[model samples]
Every structure is written in C-alpha cells, then in structure tokens.
Target chain A: NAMLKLGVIGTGAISHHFIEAAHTSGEYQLVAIYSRKLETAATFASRYQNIQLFDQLEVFFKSSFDLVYIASPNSLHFAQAKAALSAGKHVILEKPAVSQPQEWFDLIQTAEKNNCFIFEAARNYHEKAFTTIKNFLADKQVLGADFNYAKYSSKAGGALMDLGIYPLYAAVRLFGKANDATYHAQQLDNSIDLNGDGILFYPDYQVHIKAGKNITSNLPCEIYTTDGTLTLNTIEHIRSAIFTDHQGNQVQLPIQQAPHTMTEEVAAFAHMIQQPDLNLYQTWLYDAGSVHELLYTMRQTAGIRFE
Target chain B: MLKLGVIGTGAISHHFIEAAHTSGEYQLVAIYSRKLETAATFASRYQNIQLFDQLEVFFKSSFDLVYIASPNSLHFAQAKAALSAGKHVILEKPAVSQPQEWFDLIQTAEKNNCFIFEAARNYHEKAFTTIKNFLADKQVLGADFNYAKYSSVFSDRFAGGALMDLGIYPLYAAVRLFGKANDATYHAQQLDNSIDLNGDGILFYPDYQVHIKAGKNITSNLPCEIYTTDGTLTLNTIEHIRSAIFTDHQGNQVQLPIQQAPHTMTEEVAAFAHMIQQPDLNLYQTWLYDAGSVHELLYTMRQTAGIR
Candidate 1:
C-alpha cells in the first residue's frame, strides 16, 4: 500500500533500465532484486538504496512485493513468471511474453485467481505517434506494406526472439490477424537463423516483415495506399511518422517524447494497476495474443525451433 | 524482293525503319499516316518512299508487309485490315487491350498465309536471351522486376495507367522468361487523377512468383533480379535490358556480357525481318504469345486493383 512495492527478477540490462524508470517515475518503491547469484544481485543492487538482493528462488518469492518485473532468457520465462503470479505478485513480462499463447493464458488464469495484474510490456500502440498511423487519412484503399528490423544479435538464437519481434509487433498492430503467414529464411552455419522475412496477408493487403541477426538494414517501414505512402522513421521506435500524398503533400506527426523510451509502457502498467479497466486490459490481451500467435507461426514456418 | 510499308509515323516506326535499312534485306517502299503532313514529314527524311494518307491506297499497294505502330486501340483494326489484305503485319507493343483482338488478328494472319507480330523489341535484347538461357538450368526461387519512368505521356496514356506503360516491359520480360503465370494479384497506389501512378503485383507461376514494382509517378534506379537457391541474376533495365550479371551465394557479381543498343527497337525490327524469311510462322507465334502473356497478366492486375 506504501508506493506499491516492486521486487525485481533478474539483473539483466533491461531489468536495470526498468528499475531505473521505476525510480524516475516515482510509481513504485524498489523492495527486492534477484539474480540467482548473490554476487550478481549485490553488484546490481549496490547502485540503489534500501533494496534487498536474493540468490535463491524460494527466498526471492518469499520476499514482500505488490509486483515483479521478469526479464530472463527465453527458456526460463514461463516457469519463473508462473511462480511469480502464484506468489500473488503482479507481473510485467518482457517481449515474447511467454514462449507460447497457452503459457500466457495459464498465467492470466493464475493472475485472476491471485487477484494480481499481468502485462506484456510491448506498449507500441501507446506511443502518441501511433495515433497518426492508425488514422493517417486513407481515403484510398490500403495496398501493401514492407517493414524491416534487423540488428546483429550476439546471443545465440536471439535473432527472431529479439530483433524479429519489433516488426512482428508492428505488423500485427497495423494489419491485425492475418489470413495467411508465409515465410522464407536463411540459416547461419550454426543452424540459427541469419534472417527471416515473412508476409502477413490481410484480405486486401500483404504486410512484409524482415528481421535478422546477421545483417543490418536501413529500410524504412512503409505502408502503400492508393492516395500516397505512409512511413515510420524507424520500426523499433515510432518517434515520428510522415505521410506523402500522391498530389504532393506531407502530413507530419511527431510523438511527444517520454523521459525514456520505456516511459509509455511503464506508465501504462502503473495505470493498469490503479484503474483496472477490463476493456483496456482485453485490448492489451488481444494485442499480445495476436503477436504471440503470429511470431510462433512464422518461426515454425521458417524451421526455427529455438532452445 | 519484299516491300514493307509502315503505318503511323511515330518514333518507333522511324527506329524500325532505320534498323530495317541496317539489315539491308528489305526494300523500303511506302509510308502511311492519318495526317498527310506527318507522312510527308516522314517521307522527306527517306528516299524512294510513297506517302499515302488514305488507307485504301496504302493497303492496295504491292506491299508485302505492313507494320502498324499506332495507338493501342488502333492496333487490332489496322493489323487486321493489312492481314485480311494478304499483307504480313507487325503491331506495336500491347498489340491490343483485349485478348479477342489478338485472337482475331492471328486468325486473319493464318487465313491469308501471312504473319502478325507484336513488336516487343526488349524480348530480342541480348540481355533477355542470356538471362533466359542462364535460368533454364537453375531452379528459380523468385523474381523482382521493376521499370518505372516519369513519362511525359500521362493524360495521353492515362487510360491504361502506369502498368500499361512502364509495367509491360518487366511483365513481358518476366512472361517470356517464365512462360505462363498461374495467379495474378496487385496493390495499386492511385494518383487521384483517376489513374494508377504506382503499384506492386505478384504473378505466381507454380513455386515461383514474379514481384513487380512499376509506376509513372515515381522514378528510381531499380534493377531486375532473378533469385535462385544457388545465386541471383541481376539485370540493368527491363526496358532496354542492357546487361545481366550473375551474383552467386558468395556475392560475386559476374558480368554475363550481352549485346545492347541505344534505340533497342533495331533488334526487334531485325527479329521481324528474320521471321519474315522463315518457312513457317512459329517465330511470329512465339513473340505473339509472349506479348499476349504480358497483356493478359496486366489485364488481370488492373482488374485485381479495380482500376480502369
């Protein structure tokens, strides 16, 4: 009740940044930090005041908290997240929420039973710039889209899970559930994907998503329509959007900058906890479920079965 | 000893006549134009040419072959008249907007022991032949062809859209290389002036799909690429097809040198001349089929996009 305390799970860089924003926003009091190794937790918690560190799983769960932010590797997301929800702690899980939709459903069931909230933290639609794209003056019918998000991932098998998810989330947000998912990918010598490009075919449009670990791209995300072209400055973050009409006019929409790139997502989670609107929560669920189902389908189509 | 007459004193007509002269196999004889001044202007530049403003005298003359290089809608009627008159005919690109027009022209050509050709000069460009032969052995995964020029003939050709103008070059080249397309799909970005200025399309041929990006509203240095599991074949331009380079999996761009021409219609005129001497009409039929495929796919694309 006193500032709705937060217990951190994992000492990764993302968790560090999440805790940093958690401080800067004055939403939660950081109560506990966990890293499985005491020394790692000690080093991470040394930067903050009045924060406890846990290396053991049971003692970490035993610690008092109103919420927990989970940022671990892909394989451990489900078990740790399920345990956190069962312990009556609200959860803010990172992208690729859990490996599959079924895991997310189960976590939701547990959250409802425990009366704690859960969010997928990919608040792409929360950006003010998104409203510009959602209603970018399209009197003409929609045509197609070409989006790309590529970066060299140093982690093993992190291409699609990390770099690929940006365009995946972007496409699903823009195009909705697709009629078909077709993909073609190239594999590295080590069997992980070098890159994978897929199409999410809506009834009237085909949305292309290309992501990579071996290559980097400067291709702008574009939406083609009968009237003109709409483009995002970057798929990773929509700080600004531009629409060029065929009649030679540009509509510029600049998003109000947050103190941090994760500001909107973190603020959204805090508001969800306080307001607890079923309708908004369902919209989030739909967004998360749509993207999770699609990323799974595309990865399977590209013959990527990650560890 | 065959005499050739050219109808429509357009730039294509002049280039074909120049190539015809370059071949030295035909006697340049006559010219016909809707306007007498155009025929006179065309005639002033050449020697031993008869200028005719009337269609009756032009067809009645002892010309062995008639090349029709008029607007799209006029091609079927003009070529049919020359064919029914027992004269071989060569029609300009997009021989006709409708399929039945091409069918009727072919029937007349067969009935009169003459041949009708669609002057898709790019098909005879050396780049086309070289890429075709190189791809015959390699299994093709997909193709992306683009040809978009900011044309000055916007309103004059707006009825056909950009697909009809710049798109046909890549379409015909793709059709000739890939034979027949199984499915046609398109997404057009219209110019608001009741015409499509840009678009993307998919022509599916079994496992392979030909991806086309074409327009008159935009311009870029877009190259054509044919991708296979092993390597990729890159071409300079589908309009004139100057060069084809083979890029392997190792990313080596090997120059597959092929012949090229500035006014590339010269080779097409030579192709028509070459087909005229053959005992049978197979060569003419093949070129006709190629042009027909391009038109057919383009028609399907326009219909898919729901534009006129």
Candidate 2:
C-alpha cells in the first residue's frame, strides 16, 4: 500500500520533480514512462531500476501500472488523461488539470465510468504553511487580500494558465468563490498574455490577483484583516508567513521549507488512493472546477486564447 | 521682504505654521479666522502677528505671502483673493474643487504678477528626489502604489471623498514618477451621497500600466513599488516617502540614501519660499503645470468611476 505503481507521461522538468518527489515520499514506484521517442523515455528511465519505456500509447497503457502521472503540455492534458483513464488507470494531473471547465467535467465522468481516481496535483494546497495560514485566518475578520505571482518566462503561452493558476487557486481557497470577477491583461501582439490582473469581489471584500510572464514580481501575498495583515512570502510552496498587527507587532508562523516540494502532494495522493476518500475527492473536484471556470471567464474577458 | 500670513486654523494649518517656522525664512505677520477667539489663539503662538476676523482687512495687511489650508470648497475663492491682492499663495492639496476654477486662479495669479503653489508636500521631500534620480537611468516598465488609510468622516459638500483626499497621494506619485498615462479607469465603493469610500484605479500606458490603490474605509500596508526592466524600486509610502530600496532581478536589495526633514512639510515650505524670494520662474512653472495635470487626471478618474 505504501508504493503506487506509477506511470509517467512527458519527460519535461515537472516530470523529473514528480519522480523525485515520488521517490522521496516512498509512495510511488516509477514503473513506466511514455514518450514520442523510445530513447527519450529510456533516458528518463535510466534514473530508475527498471522502467518500461513506451513509444506507443496503447502498448504503454496495456503495460503494468496502476496510476499515471500526466505532466504533458497544457493543451495535450485532456487527451492524454482521457487515454489513461479509459485504460482504467488512475491519474495525477499537474496543476491546471484541464484547459476548460467542461473538459474537467468530462474527465471526471470518464474517471467515474472507468472506476478510477483523478487528482489535480495542486501542490501548495497540501503544504503545512498553507494549512497554518488557513487556520490563522479562521478567527480573524477577513477584509481583503492581494496575491501576486509573476515570474519571467520567454516561452510562449498565456500567463493565467502558467503562472496565474497559483494566485487563482489561493484566491478561491482562501477567499471562497467570488460573486463578481474583473480581468485585464497586458498582452502581446501575438495574443500572449505577458502580464495581467484580476479583481475578485466577494460580498463585503475583494481579492486582487496579479500574474505575469514578461516580468518577475517579488511582492508578498497579503491578506488584510481588521486586526492586521497576514503575509505569505510566496503563494506556492509557502514556507514563511508573518502576521503584523496594527500596532506594529509581528508574529511569524512556524513554517519550514520542505525537502521536496512535491513530496506532500505525492503523500496526499497516496492517501486518497490507499483509502478511498470519496467526500474529499468530491470537494477537491468541486473546487478545481470552480477555479477552471474562473480561469475561463477571466481569459474570455481578457481575450486570451490557447491552441 | 519675507512677510507671511495664514488662513484656517486646522490641523494641517498648524503643520504648515510649524513648518514655516522651522524654515526660519519668513516673519509671521498676520492670521485670519472667522472666529476672533480662533484667530487670537492661533496668533498667540507667533510673535507680533496681527489677528483679523474679516478677509478684507486681512488682505489689506503688508504680508506678501499667504498660506491657505481651509476646507476644500473655499480654496479657489480664498486663493484667488490672495493672488489678486498681489500675495503669493501656497494652497493645500486637492487645491480646488474644479479644474476650471484652478485655471481661473492661475490667470488671476499671472495678471497680478503673483505665484500660486499647491502644497503637495511629499513631492518636495528629499527622498522623492533621491528616488527620482535613482530611476533616472532605469527603464521603468510599471508600478503599483497603495495609500489607503481609514477615515470615518466624508463630506460630499466639501469634496471630501476617498479619491480626492487619499487617492490623490498615489495619483500624484504616479503622475510624477511616470508621465501622463494613455488611459485610466477607477472602480470604487461609493456611499449614497456619492462619496467614494474606497477605490482602485489603473493608469494604462502602451508598454506598461500603473495601479493606484486608495481608500478611506480600509488601511493597506503595501508600499509603493516601481517595476523597472532591471529591478523594482520600492518606497515605504508614497504620501511621505522616507525609505527607498532597490531589489534587483536577482533578489538582492540595495537600500538607497534618503535624508528626512525634521518636519515632513519643511522641505515644501522652503521650496515655496524659494520660488517667490528667488523668483525661480522655471521651478514655479513646473509645479503649476504638474498641479493642473494631476487635477485633470483626478477628474478623469472620478468620472470613469462614476464618483462625484
């Protein structure tokens, strides 16, 4: 039960992180890898003892693996996850599990039909720092918040799906679903969203989310309360938080950096698989779908599109 | 040659009086208030300052300079009177209620050969000039500034909205730091009386955008930040900037040098006196132009947000 027979698709940077985290958690056994080139899969498999390399999708799905971790391109996530779920294999998809909300719902139906599980590996959701922040915010009178998650990347894509997802996730999780949403993007001539911001309005308060790929932002993610401000140094993989009161007193939360950022997520996935937590899975799916829909509305408002 | 008088005995007026005293360049010659006791109490602090309850008699005094820190609605009339009477005027921020009134006052000042200054004290801070020089060579891409402090009272009759009172600080900083924006929009929480309790706006440029977050119903501890191609320059507060630090792309922080004045308004008071005493026409002209520019920008922001 400690080890999950795991198959990985895509030999990208995140796949390496997932494999490393799986090994660190002692919860995932890397059993198979799929790539367009057999040599690419073999090169990725060289790190493990014996990983079945596959250049064909059917043969790889028919091979021995209980769960498949899909870390492919954002556009290809739906098709790859569908194939894996149709093969009766559980899935651990990277954050932004699917492009659209309907696609996410379709994948859920497919997983339900095949009697399998699918989880969007939202790594920060399970972090100790995030849990601490959530608990601290419970007793405070929440007023508003601002989340900034911008990192420079010359690679082509919209900022929302790549970098903005963290802020979107944190906003939805911390502030709950917003009643009104407004989006504006600083886009490129070719329709690439370089930088953007969204204002999510709750009944009494509002949360501002800023995302960018053309620039790097070091602003802390801050939650404003009647008492003071709760600041997260970074939203994703948050290791430090400070609450400064109106009187200039500061209380630092006891949060330490994880050895492997993905380890907690792997463990969380392992728990859901080992013991079927249907209620928890359903809640996560609901939240995931909400964020996906919010992203869609924001992109549509800003005129951001993807292939 | 350096006689000064002041109207309005408000808290900000006290700061101006203290700042003017700190400069040691002017003689406090007169004070005017509607109430004789208020004028007497204010005049008691200064040596040999005459007190008056009537504007005509106060303007008849020999004081060549007058500082006006009265209510928002009275600024234009009072400043126009001071300028028409051949007295150089220093008017407190949110200079006047309307842009046309400001232009009319400017014409009055020109016809009378007197000068008018908006007491945007923060813009005269030594730290602001330091930050400006630091960013002189850096390629500025964008910025986000917040100057939200909670104030319970908002008067619609006196033009006392969050945007006019608190928002102008960040808006002034934005316009000073980066030249005119291509387009701008504001979204605010308005009371039934059309006074904006809180709001935020975006000033759009072709390559970059500056966001100004301001309010009276809430307090934001976020500092002012200028996004540059190489690094981000951060100021502790745009209202009364005392600290500036540069964080490079590599996350290394370099604290820039800033000299703080004893009183926050001392630099501005000295600058105002210098403009008149030395007849520094260029500097005075620039201040007039900037005040008018920011006035129009504030009007545009309020109209876009549907805030009165």
Candidate 3:
C-alpha cells in the first residue's frame, strides 16, 4: 500500500525515463541512485533531493530499498539483477534481461530462492495500444500479421537484441506462444547482425516480425484477418491503431497513450510489486521467459551468439 | 515494319492489341481463334482485319509478327509454330511451362533469325526504370512485395495458380531490384488439384532478404516496400507502378516522377516492336537473359514449395 522504496542503476536515457515515470506516478519513492562513476551519479541525482548516491555496488545493495531498477548495458543486466535479487531486493531489469537461456533461469531461481520478483521492463508489453489491438482482434479470425520495429542505432549488441526484441515481444504478447519459429539475419563483416526477420508459425496463421539497427522502416504494423485488418503506424511506440474492413472503410479506435512511453510500464510493475497475487504478474513472468528463449534460439539459428 | 497478328480473343489479348495500336508500330492485319465466331468477334473492331479459325491457315497469313496471349499451357507450342514459320513472336507472361521450353523457343527463334519477346510488361514501364535509377546509388537493405487478388480459376494442370498467376510480379521485382538470390524458401497454401491458393517466399541475398507474397483466394492491402540504408521506397502496386515515394530514415518523403504508359502493356508492345524492327542483338539478348533468370527462379520456387 505504501510506496515501495526504489533505487536505480545506470544513467542512460531509459534509466532517466523510468525514473521520471516513477516520479510522475508518485507510486515509488526515489530512494537511491547507483552508477560506476560518482560524478555521473551526482550529475543524475541533481534532478532530485534527498536521494542517496552510490559508486559501489556492495555499499549500495546494503542501503535500504525494496526494489532496484537495473538499466545498465545489456551484458551487465544479469550480474546487477542477480546481485540485487540475492540481496532479497525485487529486481526490474531492462529488456534482453539476460543473454543466455541459463542466465534467465539462474536469475529466476535466484529471485525465487529469496522470495523476490524479477521483472523484465519491456515497455511495449505494458502499452495500452496492445490492449486496443487485442480488443480489435477479439471478434475477428486473425489470418496473419506483419510487425516491424527496425531503427538505425550506432551502437548495440545487434538488431535482434537491441531492436528486434520489440517486435519479438510484440509477437509473443499479441499472439500468445507460437507453435514454431524460424529466423534469418543479415550480418556485417565484423560479425554484428545488422538486421533480420523471423516467422512465428501458429496453428492457423503465421506472423512475420522484422527488426534491424542498420536501417529504418516506415511500413505500418498490420494484423490481417479474414474479415478485416488492424494496423498500427509503427510498433516502436504503437500510439494508435486503425481498423479497416474488407470494404476499405477505416476507423481509428479510441486509444490514448501514456504521457511518457515508460509511464505505463512503471505503473504496471509497481502494481505487481504491490499485489503479489496479480495474475498479470505471473503471466508476464511466463511471457518474459518465453521471449528470452525465443530470442536465444532465434539468434542461435542465425549464427549470432554472445559470450 | 510488319503487320501483327494476335492468336487469342481473351481479355489479355484485347489489352495487348490496344497497346500495340497505341505504340503505332504494328498494324492489326489478322486474328486467329479456335472458334471462327470468336475470331470474327475480335476482328470486328479492326479495319481490314482477317479472321481465321485454324492454326495452319492463321500461320500462313501475311502477318510477319504474331503476338500470342493464349492459355499458359499453350504458349510454348503456339510461340514455336509462329517462330518456325519465320514470324517474330511476343509471348505473354508465364511464357512457358518450364526452362527447357524457354530454351527450345529461344533456339527456334534463333534458327529462324527472329526474336521472341516475353511480355513482362511491368519491367519495361518507365516507372520501373526510374526506381532502378533511383536505387543505383543507395544501399539496399531489404524489401517486401505483395500482389494478390481473388480469382475463380484454380486449375493447376494449366499452370494456373496463385504463384505463377500473381506471384510473378513480386518475384520479378525482387530479382530485378536485388539481383539473383543466393538461396530462397517458399511455402504455399494448397487446395485440391495441387493448386496453391496463397504463397509466401523469401529470397536471400548476401546482405539482405526480400520477402514476397502472392495469393488468389484472398487479397491484401499492403503496399510493396523496398528498404534501403538511406530510405525506403514504396509503391501502390508493383505491377503498374505509376509513381513511387522514397522516405528517408529521418521521415522526409520524396515522390519520384515515374512515368507510366497509358496502358500497362503499352511499354511491352513498344519494346517488342523495337526488337523486331531494329533487331538490336545485344538488347534482345539482355531481355532474354532477364526473362530466363526470372523464369528459372520462379521454377525453383515452385519446386521448393512442391507446387505441381
């Protein structure tokens, strides 16, 4: 009922947005900040008052906080989250929660052994636009879907890890678990996968999910059905959705996005932290694990691996 | 340089005849059909047009060039007859059943010192060239193309299926825009009689992938898109592309001026006329190579998907 004490690691854009979302909602108290550099932590903490700053993980984990948001580089997510979960602090890890399948299982086991919850903060899974899209497809027979979320990023693990996760998560969240999946990647000479596309085959339909970091895509995300189609301009944010019938008549659904993109995810995680019995929390955990396995297997199939 | 005779009275024949007239390069001197009345019905619209119901008599007619728009299964035989009789042949799309047929027809045309043109009309459109020129300097990352429309004809025996019937447009676009695929995969929804009602395929290039979809039992509203490092090009329909737009990574869209012929088939007719009259050996060979390349790719797709 009371605000859960919150601490955050990493001073990246996503970390800042999560902090602002938590502050805007007034559901979590900003109790502490963690960074490798004291100067960076101080610069970040300048926006808020009475927040403890830490340059060392050992001392920071000892400070009083109920939940820790880990938004460090993707490779560091597992270590930081494992440390927090081992300390009996609930962990909200940013996406690509772990690189390998074993890391995901290890973090889950750590969280359970400590009776703490670990949530992957994939923002789109908590977006209201998904709810609108689901409701629109509630009455129609979904034949297939085409989802794209490619963007140009100068630095990242790869498209599948950095940008592909959005479409990957969207596919699993919107269509439930697929019966089977296949993936192909376009790689650079340096062995960095620039972009790729995958197919998630369901019992009755197939979904094509594409993502990349080397190119930008403007095609609208669309879910086709026997009767009509549901379209979103892009799945990167998915602010609104449109439905057009076989007659070519279109109507935009009454869907409103959060003031900030991270706001909804922050609220959802907060609610799950507040109410342990929330069924959505369990479903999200299951889906997050499923998404991790998919990413792992897909990348492996495409010859993209992480050490 | 010579009068043209068409041997079919179908809707495609009408379009080809109209386009041939628009090009002003051929006179419609004769018409041929299995049914005398059908030939007369088609010949009624043209001045001084001769109608014949028999193939031998039609081949003996004075027309030096023959355009064949018959059923797909009949293209090889009809084109062969026309070519062996010393008449240049313009065969419609899905020009032959298989590669050997194309090879045979090419040799037949060569032996007679004539040229056979596959009426892949879209490739000759000005818009197609404009898009090609526009991408000449850009780095292509990927592309997705689609062409599907519901049709009642579902005969696999006649090579009438979604892939050969409609998938050719996107397949042509892929091979032309991205070159030969290093590899490919295809899956199709098959109905009775080994007919594919819908199909999806991916052509793999060294650096990227091209996804193509075509169907006959269903329709799609998705536009054809070509993704590049600098921007993405989008067209309403790849088959009759009048204009295409390029949207940069920053979301600035530039609409390119793509000139399309009055009729979609007009460009093909003009190209065929130029090949027959001027007899540019290299140009004719280039067109033949392009046709052969795409035809073989399509054949591979069909075999991969197990479409009979």
Candidate 4:
C-alpha cells in the first residue's frame, strides 16, 4: 500500500494521460488494465511486465488494485463506477463524473459507506489558472461573466451537452448555483444544438454563457469581477490565465514552469487515497453534482433529450 | 383631408398623436381609450379632439386612419375593428403576436379598400432608411444589437411586454437590416414576473447572421453595430436611432447624419399620411411581414423558457 495500486477501465487517449500523469506524480502504481477486447489489453500491458490485464469486467474487478480510474464513454460511467465501488475500490472519474446526478449521489453514499475515497477529475479546480480567479471572486464585486466553450466534435452531441458544461460549471464554481436560469438552444431538425447563449441570474450579479458546435466565436472567455477582469485563455487546458487588476496592470503568477496538467489531478487524487483531502474532494464532488443538476434543467428548458 | 383617430393614452400615444398633428398631413379628429377617464385625460391636451371610450363608436368616427398605440393585449382587436369599419389602421410595434393575425388584418383592409401599417417606429427615422439602403448592397457580414430599458424607467412602460415592446426594436432592426430569417434561435432567462430579464437571439439569413441581446432588468450602453464588406455602421441607440457613425476596416470613424427629427413619430405619421394619399402605395404590408417574423422569434424564446 506504499503507492496505491490502480486499474484503468478504458484505454482512451485520456487514459493515456492518466497513466503518464501517475508516472509524473510518482504517487500511484498501475497494477492492472481493463479493455473489453483481450488483444488491446495485452498491447497496453506490454508496456509493463508483471501487471494484470482485464478483458472481462468481472475478472478485472476481482483483480488486485486499490483504486479504479474510469475514462469510459459517458453512457457506461455509472455501471462501471458502481461495479468498481462494489469491489471496494476507490474511484477517480474523468470530468463529468456521471451523466446523471443520481449516479453521483449514489456513488457518494457508497464511497462513504465503504470508506473508499471517490473524486471527479475536474482539473480546473486544481489548475493554477483559476486560483487567482477564486481569490478575487470573494474580494471583488462581480459585474457580469461570459464563458464560452466551442468544440468541433464529430460525434452526435449538441452544444449544450458537447461544449456547454465548462462555462456552466465554471460559473457554478466561481459563483454558486443560480436561483434561476433560461437556456435557448439553436436546435437542429435532427435534435442537435448548434449554439446556445443565455443568462443565469443571481441576485446581485449575472453570468452569460454561449457555447457552440457548428459555429465559431471570436470572444474571449473572461470573468469581469467589478474592478478587475480575469481572462482565461483556455477553459479546458490552460496555457495561460491573466488576471488584470483595475489599474496597476497585472501580477505575474506563481507556477511559471509549464505544468504536467494531468499530473496535478493524479497527485490530488493520490493524496485523497492517503487520507481524505476532504476540502478539494468535496468541492469537486459538489461541483460535479451541481453541474449535472444545472445541465438537466438547461436541457429541459431547451427541449433536448439524450439517450 | 385625411382625418386621424388615436387609441391609448400611454406616452407612446402622446408622441404618436403629436406626430400625427405635426405632420400637417391630417387633422386630429378623435381619441379613444377603453376607460372614459383615460380618454378624457388624453382629450384635455388637445383643443378640438373628440373623445370616445367605446370601441365600436370610436371606429365610427370620421377618420381616414386609426393609429393604435393601445396595450399589447388590445392591438389585434382594435386594428381589426378599425379595418372592419373601413378605416386605415396604423399598429404599434407588436402589431399582433401571431403572423396569422397580420394576414387576417391584411384581408380585412383589402376588402375594405384601406391600408394597414405596422408601426415599427424606428423604421420611420432616416437611420432606418440609411441602413435599409446600406443593407441593399448584399455585402453585409453580421450585426450585433443591444436594446434594453429598465421597466420601472418607462413612464410609458408596459408591465410585462418586455420582449414585445422593448425587444421588438432590435428584432425589427435585425429584420430590416438583414432580410427574412431562414432560421432562428435564442437563449433567455425570465424573472418570476414572467418578464425576460436578458437574452441573446439570432436570425440566420442565407449569407449573414444578426445577433441581438435585449432585456428589461439589465442596462447596457452599447450601440447597434451592423457590418458590411465595405465598412461598419453603428447606431447610437435602437430606441431613437439618430446618430450614425461609419467605421471602416482601417478604423476611421465619421458621423453620417441621416436623422430626420429628434421626435421619432413625426416622420412615422407623415409616412402614414403619404400612404393615405397614394392608396396604391402600401408600404405597411412590407413592415407587417417584418413584424410578424420578429414575433415568431419572440414566441420561440418564451416557449424555450417555458413561459407559455
């Protein structure tokens, strides 16, 4: 138990990052790998010797590991995470821990009952980019915010589902749940949203979100907090985040060295395994729940239903 | 001479009725409000204006055109009544909520040998004519508009017609600047008061997109900017689009003064008078179509918000 042994559920590109991040953090050990197909598991395991591989989920759960890292498709998230939890393993889920809120709720309870730690791998919380933002949020009075997430996904996901969550969740983190929200989807004949833009009104301040799939926007994603504006260059992966003060120009931030973005998530989750990093874990876990709830309401208003 | 009868006593009715009199093209003959008190209040301002509270009798007055600035709920009924009574009608911003009503009014006017105009008041100003002409170049790229006024601020403010009354200006500008929308979409948030607080909407034309954000609770000081291949034209305010500045790609900005009057209604009423004289010239039909299209988006935004 020196290094918490880990098993990965899916070998997507993100899983590749998680494996490299574990190495970068030097905190977690990859004891097993699981792929639905046998040969793919072997090819993945060929990188390391004396590590168990899983082609079948039941046998994989029965395999040796302290935690299960889920990087599966959205639809399969709940079932696989539930199976891993039943096996009494800690869980590190990719962003959007589950498609539905109830899944996150059940996972929270099960993890609590079994004394296993569970966390959503939402890197934004751990990213150095938003630390400056989090500080000013409480100190400064916020005017308005516009968070845009424009992704060109080939698969069938609407704007609200595909690229909308980042801005929605960011606002939730920066400013808690909005009392009321209205979403208007640029829905297609085939029931896909191309672009969606709306306001989420809190009492003293309001946040604006406009996300797109087919179209492109030239607006920067910035949070204008009364006096200062924090400009985030990338919502998904931060190459840079600049917080320009009211006048003094700016402050060059800490962590100048380019971060192994995924490594911080691995380190944080690994620390949670050591004990409970309750503050960070609870914050991210709570954000995932609010995100799902907000998404549900937004989709209902926009008349979008996904299978 | 063309004779005018006015409906509603809202501040808009004051400006519009005053505009009708200022045009010197028609004699103000009658005034009507559902409430006798409101009608009397309106009539007291004018020396020879006759006041009537009943709808049927008001339509019976010897007026060539009836300009209806009544509440949004009463527009369809009043416009239809005037047309049925064989009088020309001028309707306020949201002439009717539905396009079918516009069709119905057109039929009534056609049979009665009268004309019907949907008063998108901004369209009367020369800023409208300038942009309307500028847009004809077919080189338009995109447009952005922000039109919002605090509801408590409208001395003439209607209670809950936020989108219908305030939002209509941007939508009208979008419709007039761009052509008919091939597609439409919006994202909006509504207050518990059932009034939309803020929203971003788009009208997708074949070659261009017109994006507009309109609201009641929020206040923004941005002008409406329309882009063309040659340059950009910015209107000071959609409410009264008076000062227009053209900024080219090189960033040279200059004022192109095409404004008619500080008062928006004078030209609008004069246009109505022109329509009356040239019975063959029914420009109202064109604006009616535009107003109907904007309402379709308004309805879609409300439906998206589950406003019913």
Q: Estimate each model's TM-score.
A: 0.63, 0.94, 0.92, 0.60
DockQ (CA atoms), all models: 0.09, 0.39, 0.42, 0.05
Give the candidates in order of lDDT, highest first.
2, 3, 1, 4
**Reference-based TM-score, model 1:** 0.63
Residue pairs of candidate 1 with colliding backbone atoms: none
Arrange candidates, best DockQ first: 3, 2, 1, 4
> Stretches of candidate 3 above 4 Å error?
B35-49, B150-158, B192-195, B249-253
Which runs in model 2 stand beyond 4 Å of their true positions? A154-156, B151-159, B190-194
Which ten contiguous residues of candidate 4 chain A have the minimum total lDDT?
A251-260
lDDT of 4 by residue, A87-114 (tens): 8888888766777678889988888787
Which model, 3 or 4, shows the larger lDDT?
3
lDDT of 4: 0.71
**Winner by TM-score between candidate 3 and candidate 2:** 2
Tens digit of per-residue lDDT, candidate 1, span A1-307: 2476898877878888888888776787798988878898888888788888888876787678888888787578788877888888888887768877788788888888988778886756556566557765434566667776755434424567667777877776766778767555656545566665567767755676667654444446777665667777676557666777766688776556565778777877887887778898987777788777777777777677655
How much is the lDDT of residue B55 in candidate 2?
90
Candidate maximizing lDDT? 2
Rate residue A283 of model 1 by lDDT: 78
User: What TM-score does the predicted chain A of each candidate obtain versus native chain A?
Assistant: 0.93, 0.96, 0.94, 0.89
Lowest-sum lDDT 10-residue window in model 2 chain B: B150-159
C-alpha lDDT of all candidate models, in order: 0.74, 0.82, 0.81, 0.71
Instruction: Give the C-alpha miss distance for residue A104 in model 3, angstroms.
Output: 2.9
* lDDT per residue (tens digit) for residues A55-96 in model 3: 999778778899999888878888888889888899998887
